[PDB]
Ligand binder design. Sequence first.
Ligand code: HEM
Ligand SMILES: CCCCCCCCO
Length: 401
Amino acid sequence: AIPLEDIDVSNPELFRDNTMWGYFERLRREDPVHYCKDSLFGPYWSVTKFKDIMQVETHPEIFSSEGNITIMESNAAVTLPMFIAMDPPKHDVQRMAVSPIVAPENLAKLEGLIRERTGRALDGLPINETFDWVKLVSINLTTQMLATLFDFPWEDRAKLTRWSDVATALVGTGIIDSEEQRMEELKGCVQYMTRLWNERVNVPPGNDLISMMAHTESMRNMTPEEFLGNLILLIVGGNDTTRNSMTGGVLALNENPDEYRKLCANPALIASMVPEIVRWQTPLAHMRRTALQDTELGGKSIRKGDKVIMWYVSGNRDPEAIENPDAFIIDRAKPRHHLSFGFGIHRCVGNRLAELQLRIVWEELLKRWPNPGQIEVVGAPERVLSPFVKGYESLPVRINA
Ligand code: HEM
Ligand SMILES: CCCCCCCCO
């Protein structure tokens, strides 16, 4: 309906209302590398096709991550130094320092702890009564995992969920009312983690992220802003994406009862379902780059300093890359063929830990409630107002047993 030159896919309302899909379909068909002059976030390029996103991801010497990796320009948290928002060489050193916490030798030891925690959380759910899945399952388990990643005082766990929400929120969406309040609450995050750092620098490293960072020579002189940037990366990385994936799967099985039927008939399909849930959800809708020089991408002239947006949410629905991409299919032959974890030097380091948490939830769900329709959505979900976080504030669920 709207003239092509004035499509603004970044409009946060489109993500809350779940209407953004159509605009991305339109851009994929008519103008896959689309310039937007007017938005909440100033001008930017939209890269909407799987092939073109792969192209941007694999040319970091052209498409820099340096200052910021989001479309947001007024959010002072996303402009803090963080290794996701760094080019090589500094990026490579800081990624290697965090990578060990989510290394498979440490994911075997974690599998048992995730299973006991998951079991206990499901055992505490009410039966034949509506509850909020996001509060009782998704926030609950993902927060527990992030506390363990940080060796965070378990009694203070909920602080992690808050800091995560504050880092990514739009002003006046129910989280924080101004940038001054965002930085005030994140000051408390830096203060808390600084106490933990002081206890763990100058003593043998623990297996916990604060220890790993305090004992990597390149990170030892970090300013509180540098420390806070990496903290919020790890905090939003280590809860919000898995959280929205955990919620997303319940919704996807309820919208597609045929797939819920296949799953219950063959619980081995969890192996191929989990990657599909992560594609379907695309918990981070996009990632931003900044052109360091004039370049051509899908036959378009991108200028020096231009903001480029890789819309994973569009790429994961690209029929050129994925057969029948708008269907939720839990038994795809190549179900890990998606952009939800991105690609290239910044490819998600936590992807195996995210998939491990999701596998264990679905295993433990089916051991207790194995029949199709038992985990039922009984109300519309409340979606997040963001072009970055594609997630759920609430999801009403009733377990029929
Ligand atoms: C469903 C779950 C998850 C999704 C969808 C997700 C998605 C992503 C995406 C898109 C990126 C940027 C990739 C790029 O631009 O090419 C990323 C990076 C990252 N993710 Fe995740 N992630 C998830 C889970 C996790 C978890 C559990 C951790 C745990 C600590 C984590 C830590 C990171 C970190 C540290 C980076 C920065 C990587 C770098 O620049 O080298 N992520 N993730
Ligand atoms: C602004 C907080 C960090 C945003 C990037 C998180 C990426 C986790 O996959």
